[PDB]
Design a protein around this ligand. Structure first.
Ligand code: CLA
Ligand code: CLA
Ligand code: CLA
Ligand code: CLA
Ligand code: CLA
Ligand code: CLA
Ligand code: CLA
Ligand code: CLA
Ligand SMILES: CC1=CCCC(C)(C)[C@H]1/C=C/C(C)=C/C=C/C(C)=C/C=C/C=C(C)/C=C/C=C(C)/C=C/C1=C(C)CCCC1(C)C
Ligand SMILES: CC1=CCCC(C)(C)[C@H]1/C=C/C(C)=C/C=C/C(C)=C/C=C/C=C(C)/C=C/C=C(C)/C=C/C1=C(C)CCCC1(C)C
Ligand SMILES: CC1=C(C/C=C(\C)CCC[C@H](C)CCC[C@H](C)CCCC(C)C)C(=O)c2ccccc2C1=O
Lengths: 42, 161, 732, 107, 139, 80, 30, 90
């Protein structure tokens, strides 16, 4: 894959948008399978 | 119980919360036919609402006079799952993010163009750092005691006063 | 060309800026041309007498207007049903419906109902008729004149004190503790024992009969025997009707604790014994310092000796004595910080422990008094930090303060400022985060997913004082405790009755809504402190302006270079913290008033459920209680809440006009004014008239001050109109 | 007159499916106020099948415009004397764009 | 040296941006310059004027207005022949710029330094030290 | 008028003098810097306080310092 | 109730305060 | 800014030694460290005893036990004076 295109995807706004979309996405998935967790179950 | 609170499993106001929440959904369900997509959507919401109320009742949460769960955060172990353990979980992630971010800013200082490493992140090296964060409490304290976390006051720029 | 006679730099300005700046600098005597230190202290001395007379004239007018136009005598007969009158209205802009709508209070003329509580204070301390209200007004008119003459007299050449007098720290402290604080607390104990307590028991005691009416039947014989407890015998019964002889005791010095059951106020014999005890303690305190007879302390010696030997404070307080004595701004800051805390204690302890009879059934007076004194507190607290900033810029000498507590503060100012920055952000992220979580979770129909933290630490403190509401069974709440057994023969029985009735405001029940707002109030206290501390500690210099102290306290900026330096002065951090002070007192008074109006209705559960999200504050407090206020006039008529309805809109108008001075800045306005100057000169019949002062746009600093004043004035008028009209309209 | 227009349906995640209100017609969704339904009836759409063809027609146009922006910057960029033809541009934007736009829409 | 009041003025059609009553009762500023051409320039107070070939003369209300024109006349028309005068209503004409025949950014002998402080800016005196004293903060 | 000061950290770059819109500053001879020249403020009665000189100055802390003072017709930049 | 003569006593004493306030203000003004 | 006055008999009390000079003790500058230490324990015992005897406070408290109870905080200042004198060789 082109190294200048990979250097473009390594730029701060793309990584910030991708990482926080990935981060938001597994919070969303964790609340789909395991909803309404007000407390650590113990 | 604690602070004059009632366990949610025997609170009558918690019981009325669950019933009112389901009556509100059932009257919306009364306007749809059985196999329709709006009927299945609301029937799945009545199942979810009942499950949540059942779980809260059996969890050891304490309800108020208002029938809502209240959190006890004074440090007692019977209630550590409401703040102390979520907090221990948080600080592990937070220190991980902090240790990993700190490790990359120190790497980028030794670069050919240090400010280009911060707007164009060296993703293989930055991923090398994110994996290292799992033992940040040991790595950061050894960093502290080996004189590499804290810089002395006389290498820090301060205002004249 | 001669108005700023104290400033030749302003008196030679040819613009309209001279009039504005001369008015705004008039009281800053230190900056006036040719000011010596002798004259600075002598003008402050006289203008303190002049301020004192203004306070006595303000008080005499309140007494006079109530004696003349009030219904004090009718109110005294039936104090829970009559609404006290402040003064009458004579306004030729009124219509005849307005004249009728304001003719309440049992009188035949338009009047303003009083929210100040002066009726309850004057009743409790003894006043019964209009003729002793007027006698008090006459005394204050005399006292104002005596202090006006004293101010003029101590400006005369022989009566002007020397700087050695003004800086006698030990003699002034001895007299202010033992005489101004202590003896007058003792003299106020005498007034209650001789006048207020007898007239609370039906017996009139005035100048006419005081020397022949004994406060106690035994009478100054138990005092000279050590049988002091004979003065606590037969306290007022719980059947006592205040102002009358029925149910009355003979005691003058008691420690019963709790409230008089009918007035719902502290016992007058507890209050007299409070002032006797406080007065004795203060008189002893006023013997601490050495003046002329060889006993006592040198203040300089105490400060020099308090350097901890571990060396963690450096040189300690060596040289603080000279720094505080020579800096009036350092003295002012200590006084304002101390005064600011007290006026906050006054607001907190007067709603929970009221001393005046039948007040705390005056929901409007109780609300206005709290709101008034917390706002005074926030202003005093800002001023202390502002004058601490003025101290560092102007009066602080780093070479007379080598390695002090003061110099070592400035040595780790970034440690202090960054840790305020962290704690503000720490509080702000999570306090706002929980509230937004609760709002979103409640909006989606799931209020049981709210994060509701029980404020157990405060509930445990309530229980430690005997509150039997949370089952904590600790200290005073515990029946068999060393704490509970110790106070049992004195105030414990009366206090437990007072704190375990849900009929007063002593240690009000708290829950998750109270937890959340206290952490918001904590956020606002640390953030206001941050701006003010950053203003004080960066006042002398920073990295942008390392020579910031050469420019003063209030300067506009250092220009657009070095990135831009708008709001870089220490004054500008006063400016910025004023918004945060207004925000915090808003959060405090919004909380106090909503918690009280819901309790006064009998619906404390409405606060309990709706305070945990922000829409509950918006609809159940601001929107719900707005309706009596905004209906003070409408196309269907008007009532006596029409004035507050107008002040409400008036306050929104002043507040918004302040935005114009804060958002739009000078360059736009100076260029308009140049087009207006052109048009006047070119307009026939109008260019016959010429300005003496060239019209100019307001200065950069002045516009900040003008916008801040408009913002602040709009803030006060709006809330006062709301807190008074919503409480009046509801009566609950 | 009875059904409320709605063209946005939310996923059930954190209780947010309360936003799928009863807009009518055996349907749950977010009520939309942009007036597209009234446009489509004015256009004579009358079925979801034709709405899919309009959606494809937009996508093909969307691809053609991004191609033209690339093409006219990187492959075939007009010279300044092309852009400085104000009489030609006005003739075409009055006659061709606005005039044939109205005439075709009238048809 | 003195302003020759008879020097022709650049062709201008007038504007509302010119000087007001304060120029005829307090002070007025004038700028003269030599132009090799009859060319359009921009007035500091408004629109465009045309400077005549040869010697031009303007009157402005502010000293900064004369120098803002001087900057423009030297940056776009390469005229460095500009002399700025101050004129009082008493008739007194005060030569201003360049003050000694040489531009300020070029050094000249016989210029005495005003405002020069022998130490760096951080060596000033603290305000408390010079309180109730006439002593200056620059050491 | 405004008070304009030049400190002996001036490197003689003449940039303040070129940036001054009111001809307040000029260059005088010196021997304390390599350039042999220092900025001077002989005409501060004409200083309007714009601080364009301070912006132009490249020494770490400004060799030229403007201190805004009493306002006049000249220093308020009034054409009226 | 308050008589008008009593109001007039207050106006006399407040007038005495106005005269003393002027003199204190003139002394402060110098 | 002008001379700040202090009462006559003001002396210098700033110390950087192990213990302050005995001048910080005022009228007790000549008392021995043994005498403060014995007074310190005596005031602590008598003050605690008098305090203990009136913990349930009545409307008739013994005035000697009240006055004697003020010896407990006074003992704190006594052992500080005992430490100061011992470290000054008194
Ligand atoms: C009849 C001729 C004609 C037409 C229709 C247009 C149309 C347009 N020109 Mg113009 N243009 C023309 C001739 C024409 N031009 C000439 C001769 C010149 C040289 C002087 C220019 C120079 C020029 C410049 C410099 C710019 C335009 C721009 C635009 C667009 C304006 C934004 C807009 O409303 O688009 C939305 C409206 C639409 C209707 C979208 C339609 C898209 C296609 C291209 C329209 C034509 C399709 C086709 C002819 C129809 C086939 C019908 C068939 C089914 C029967 C628009 C597409 C501007 C622009 O946005 O650039 C992209 C712009 O910056 N034009
Ligand atoms: C406001 C101050 C405050 C503070 C700082 C604490 C702090 C603490 N409390 Mg809490 N508490 C408070 C007020 C406070 N409490 C109040 C006012 C009450 C009501 C009386 C309680 C009631 C309370 C109970 C009932 C208990 C605590 C416990 C604890 C401790 C458990 C945390 C831990 O993991 O340590 C200990 C564990 C480790 C160091 C390692 C664990 C792995 C912790 C020290 C618990 C405890 O263990 O007490 C010591 C406990 O049982 N608290
Ligand atoms: C991971 C990097 C990192 C680390 C270790 C720190 C460390 C610290 N910061 Mg933070 N800070 C950072 C990034 C970082 N900062 C960024 C990016 C900003 C801009 C928003 C700030 C803004 C900031 C302020 C305004 C304040 C601090 C404060 C502090 C101190 C206390 C902790 C705190 O308040 O956190 C607070 C953290 C934030 C407010 C923002 C953090 C935002 C993200 C989560 C961190 C950045 C992640 C980064 C992209 C890492 C990528 C790594 C990858 C390339 C391998 C501590 C010195 C406070 C202080 O001085 O108190 C003593 C303080 O007041 N910082
Ligand atoms: C016993 C002798 C004595 C007394 C009574 C005073 C009294 C006073 N002096 Mg002092 N003074 C004295 C000796 C004395 N002085 C000596 C010996 C010296 C020379 C060494 C000075 C030098 C001196 C200076 C230089 C100044 C004063 C000033 C003042 C006035 C202070 C302002 C004021 O009214 O505060 C009144 C304060 C109180 C009544 C106590 C404070 C109360 C606190 C804040 C809380 C109270 C709460 C309580 C519940 C109140 C309830 C109110 C009610 C509505 C419920 C005050 C009248 C100042 C002044 O104003 O000059 C005119 C001033 O500038 N004095
Ligand atoms: C007893 C209280 C007290 C006293 C004696 C003073 C006295 C003073 N203050 Mg302080 N101040 C106070 C309370 C007080 N203030 C409070 C509560 C606040 C917060 C709102 C401030 C905020 C404050 C600021 C921000 C400033 C002052 C300034 C001043 C000085 C001049 C005031 C002036 O000329 O305006 C007189 C105004 C009029 C006559 C027009 C009406 C003067 C030394 C100013 C000053 O010169 O300090 C260097 C200044 O900049 N004060
Ligand atoms: C609602 C109005 C509001 C809000 C929220 C703030 C918030 C804040 N102010 Mg400001 N301020 C305001 C009005 C406001 N101010 C006004 C009117 C003034 C008068 C001019 C000031 C003057 C002022 C000064 C002078 C100071 C502050 C400070 C602060 C901070 C104090 C609270 C804190 O430390 O943590 C609270 C933190 C927050 C509220 C941040 C919110 C978290 C965000 C929303 C996360 C959301 C991320 C999200 C995905 C973004 C989406 C973007 C989208 C395009 C994708 C904070 C950043 C102080 C400061 O910065 O100290 C550190 C400070 O010194 N403020
Ligand atoms: C700097 C943060 C901060 C600040 C300024 C305050 C301030 C306040 N709190 Mg809050 N509080 C905080 C953090 C904070 N709290 C946290 C993190 C908790 C645990 C959930 C609480 C729990 C709490 C309760 C239960 C109550 C208060 C109350 C109050 C008020 C009275 C004083 C008090 O009890 O202090 C409390 C002080 C502390 C708990 C000390 C916190 C200091 C550390 C540095 C904060 C961070 C700890 C960290 C996150 C946890 C460690 C890890 C752990 C999970 C293993 C006051 C408004 C009381 C009140 O009046 O409410 C109406 C009350 O009853 N607070
Ligand atoms: C914590 C408070 C504190 C402390 C440590 C001291 C300490 C001292 N006081 Mg002070 N004093 C205090 C409160 C205090 N006092 C108070 C509240 C008052 C008011 C009643 C006094 C009034 C007072 C007087 C009048 C005198 C002392 C004296 C003394 C010294 C006598 C030691 C002694 O008796 O040797 C054995 C000692 C340094 C004497 C002395 O020499 O002062 C320097 C002295 O004459 N004290
Ligand atoms: C802000 C301010 C500025 C400078 C500093 C400062 C001084 C310290 C400060 C103070 C300001 C202060 C303290 C201001 C104080 C202002 C005051 C007290 C003003 C009082 C005015 C009273 C009047 C005019 C009443 C007059 C009555 C009359 C004429 C009745 C007369 C009569 C009637 C009918 C009946 C009787 C017979 C006669 C005689 C015929
Ligand atoms: C900016 C500036 C620059 C330099 C100069 C400057 C002017 C000095 C400065 C200004 C500084 C300023 C403006 C400073 C402001 C400082 C302030 C407002 C300090 C507040 C102090 C309150 C305290 C210590 C309360 C203590 C209560 C206690 C111990 C209660 C205890 C308890 C009791 C008795 C009863 C209940 C149980 C418990 C809880 C046990
Ligand atoms: C509106 C506005 C003006 C124009 C306002 C001017 C020029 C003031 C005109 C006010 C009139 C002439 C008097 C107002 C009268 C006051 C209501 C009462 C003042 C008198 C008391 C103080 C005694 C500015 O000059 C300005 C400057 C910098 C930033 C923002 C602004 C800004 O917003």
């Amino acid at each position: 894959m082109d190294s200048n295109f990979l250097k473009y995807l390594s730029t701060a706004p793309v990584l910030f948008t991708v990482w926080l979309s990935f981060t938001a996405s597994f919070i969303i998935e964790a609340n789909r399978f395991f909803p309404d967790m007000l407390y650590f179950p113990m | 119980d604690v602070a004059g609170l009632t366990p949610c499993g025997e609170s009558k106001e918690f019981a009325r919360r669950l019933d009112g929440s389901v009556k509100k959904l059932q009257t919306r369900l009364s306007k749809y036919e059985a196999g329709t997509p709006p009927a299945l959507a609301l029937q799945k919401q009545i199942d979810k609402t009942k499950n949540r109320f059942d779980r809260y009742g059996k969890a050891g949460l304490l309800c108020g006079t208002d029938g809502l769960p209240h959190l006890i955060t004074d440090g007692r172990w019977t209630h550590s799952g409401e703040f102390v353990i979520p907090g221990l979980l948080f600080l592990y992630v937070a220190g991980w993010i902090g240790w990993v971010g700190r490790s990359y800013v120190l790497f980028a200082r030794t670069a050919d163009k240090p400010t280009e490493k911060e707007i164009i992140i060296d993703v293989p090296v930055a991923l090398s750092f994110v994996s290292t964060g799992f033992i940040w409490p040991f790595s950061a304290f050894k960093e502290f005691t080996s004189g590499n976390l804290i810089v002395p006051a006389d290498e820090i720029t301060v205002s004249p006063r | 060309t001669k108005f700023p006679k104290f400033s030749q730099a302003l008196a030679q300005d040819p613009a309209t800026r001279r009039i504005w700046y001369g008015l705004a600098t008039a009281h800053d005597l230190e900056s006036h041309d040719g000011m010596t230190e002798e004259n600075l202290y002598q003008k402050i001395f006289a203008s303190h007498f002049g301020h004192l007379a203004v306070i006595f004239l303000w008080t005499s007018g309140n007494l006079f207007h109530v004696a003349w136009q009030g219904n004090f005598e009718q109110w005294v007969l039936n104090p829970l049903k009559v609404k006290p009158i402040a003064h009458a209205i004579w306004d030729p802009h009124f219509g005849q419906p307005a004249v009728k709508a304001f003719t309440k209070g049992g009188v035949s003329y338009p009047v303003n109902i009083a929210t100040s509580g002066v009726y309850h204070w004057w009743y409790t301390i003894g006043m019964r008729s209009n003729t002793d209200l007027y006698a008090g007004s006459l005394f204050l008119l005399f006292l104002a004149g005596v202090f006006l003459f004293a101010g003029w007299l101590h400006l005369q050449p022989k009566f002007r004190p020397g700087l050695s007098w003004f800086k006698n720290n030990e003699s002034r402290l001895n007299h202010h503790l033992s005489g101004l604080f202590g003896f007058s607390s003792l003299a106020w104990s005498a007034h209650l024992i001789h006048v207020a307590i007898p007239e609370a028991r039906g017996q009139h005691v005035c100048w006419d009969n005081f020397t022949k009416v004994a406060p106690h039947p035994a009478g100054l014989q138990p005092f000279f025997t050590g049988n002091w407890g004979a003065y606590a015998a037969s306290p007022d019964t719980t059947n006592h009707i205040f102002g009358t002889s029925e149910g009355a005791g003979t005691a003058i010095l008691t420690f019963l604790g709790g409230f008089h059951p009918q007035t719902q106020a502290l016992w007058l014999t507890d209050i007299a014994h409070h002032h006797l005890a406080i007065g004795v303690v203060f008189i002893f305190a006023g013997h601490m310092y050495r003046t002329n007879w060889g006993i006592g302390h040198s203040l300089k010696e105490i400060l020099d000796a308090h350097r901890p030997p571990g060396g963690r404070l450096g040189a300690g307080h060596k040289g603080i004595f000279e720094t505080l004595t020579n800096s009036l701004h350092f003295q002012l800051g200590l006084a304002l910080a101390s005064l600011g805390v007290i006026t906050s204690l006054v607001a907190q302890h007067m709603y929970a422990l009221p001393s005046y009879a039948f007040i705390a059934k005056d929901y409007v007076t109780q609300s206005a008094l709290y709101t008034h004194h917390q706002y005074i507190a926030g202003f005093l607290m800002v001023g202390a930090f502002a004058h601490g900033a003025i101290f560092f810029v102007r009066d602080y000498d780093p070479e007379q303060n080598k390695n002090n507590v003061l110099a070592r503060i400035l040595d780790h100012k970034e440690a202090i400022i960054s840790h305020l920055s962290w704690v503000s952000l720490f509080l702000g992220f999570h306090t706002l985060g929980i509230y937004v979580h609760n709002d979103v979770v409640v909006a989606f129909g799931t209020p049981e997913k709210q994060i509701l933290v029980e404020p157990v630490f405060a509930q445990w403190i309530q229980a430690s004082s005997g509150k039997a509401l949370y089952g904590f069974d600790v200290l005073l709440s515990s029946t068999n405790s060393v704490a509970a057994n110790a106070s049992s023969n004195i105030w414990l029985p009366g206090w437990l009755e007072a704190i375990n009735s849900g009929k007063n405001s002593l240690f009000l029940p708290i829950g998750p809504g109270d937890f959340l707002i206290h952490h918001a109030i904590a956020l606002a206290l640390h953030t206001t402190t941050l701006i003010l501390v950053k203003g004080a500690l960066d006042a002398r210099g920073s990295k942008l302006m390392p020579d910031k102290k050469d420019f003063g306290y209030a300067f506009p900026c250092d220009g657009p270079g070095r990135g831009g330096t708008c709001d870089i002065s220490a004054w500008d951090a006063f400016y910025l913290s004023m918004f945060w002070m207004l925000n915090t007192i808003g959060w405090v008074t919004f909380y106090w008033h909503w918690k009280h109006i819901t309790i006064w209705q009998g619906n404390a559960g409405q606060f309990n459920e709706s305070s945990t999200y922000i829409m509950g504050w918006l609809r159940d407090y601001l929107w719900l209680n707005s309706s009596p206020l905004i209906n003070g006039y409408n196309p269907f008529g008007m009532n006596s809440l029409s004035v507050w309805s107008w002040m409400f809109l008036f306050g929104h108008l002043i507040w918004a006009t302040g935005f114009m001075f804060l958002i739009s800045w000078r360059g736009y306005w100076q260029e308009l004014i140049e087009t207006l100057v052109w048009a006047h000169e070119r307009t026939p019949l109008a260019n016959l008239v010429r300005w003496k002062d060239k019209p100019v746009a307001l200065s950069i600093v002045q516009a900040r001050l003008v916008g801040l004043i408009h913002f602040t004035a709009g803030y006060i008028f709006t809330y006062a109109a709301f807190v008074i009209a919503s409480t009046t309209g509801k009566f609950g | 007159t009875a059904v409320k227009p709605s063209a946005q349906v939310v996923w059930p995640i954190v209780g947010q499916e309360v936003l799928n209100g009863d807009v009518g017609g055996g349907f749950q969704g977010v009520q939309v106020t942009s007036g597209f339904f009234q446009i489509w009836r004015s256009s004579g759409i009358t079925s979801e099948v034709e709405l899919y063809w309009c959606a494809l027609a937009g996508l093909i146009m969307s691809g053609l415009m991004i191609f033209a922006g690339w093409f006219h910057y990187h492959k075939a960029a007009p010279k300044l004397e092309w852009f400085q033809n104000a009489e030609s541009m006005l003739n075409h934007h009055l006659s061709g764009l606005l005039g044939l736009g109205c005439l075709s829409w009238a048809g | 040296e003195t302003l020759n009041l008879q020097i022709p003025s650049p062709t201008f059609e007038g504007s509302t941006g010119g000087w007001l009553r304060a120029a005829e009762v307090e002070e007025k500023y004038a700028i003269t310059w030599t132009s090799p051409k009859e060319q359009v320039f921009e007035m500091p107070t408004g629109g465009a004027a045309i400077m005549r070939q040869g010697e031009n003369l303007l009157y402005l209300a502010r000293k900064e207005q004369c120098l803002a024109l001087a900057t423009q006349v030297k940056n776009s028309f390469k005229i460095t022949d500009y002399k700025v005068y101050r004129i009082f209503p008493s008739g007194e004409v005060q030569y201003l710029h360049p003050k000694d025949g040489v531009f300020p950014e070029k050094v000249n002998a016989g210029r005495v330094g005003v405002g020069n402080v022998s130490h760096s800016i951080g060596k000033n005196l603290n305000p408390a030290q010079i309180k109730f004293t006439s002593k200056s903060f620059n050491g | 008028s405004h008070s304009v000061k030049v400190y002996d950290t001036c490197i003689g770059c003449t940039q303040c003098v070129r940036a001054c819109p009111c001809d307040v500053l000029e260059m005088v001879s010196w021997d304390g810097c390599k350039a042999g020249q220092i900025a001077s403020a002989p005409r501060t009665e004409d200083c309007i306080g714009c601080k364009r000189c301070e912006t132009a100055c490249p020494t770490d802390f400004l060799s030229v310092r403007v201190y805004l003072g009493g306002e006049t017709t000249r220093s308020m930049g009034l054409a009226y | 109730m308050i008589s008008d003569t009593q109001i007039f006593i207050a106006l006399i004493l407040a007038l005495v305060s106005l005269v003393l306030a002027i003199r204190l203000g003139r002394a402060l003004y110098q | 800014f002008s001379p700040v006055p202090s009462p006559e008999g003001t002396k210098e009390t700033y110390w950087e030694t192990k213990a302050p000079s005995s001048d910080v003790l005022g009228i007790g500058a000549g008392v021995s460290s043994g005498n403060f230490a014995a007074a310190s324990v005596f005031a602590a015992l008598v003050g605690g005893y008098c305090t203990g005897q009136v913990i349930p406070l009545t409307v008739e408290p013994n005035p000697l036990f009240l006055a004697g109870s003020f010896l407990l905080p006074y003992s704190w200042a006594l052992h500080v004076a005992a430490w100061i004198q011992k470290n000054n060789g008194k």
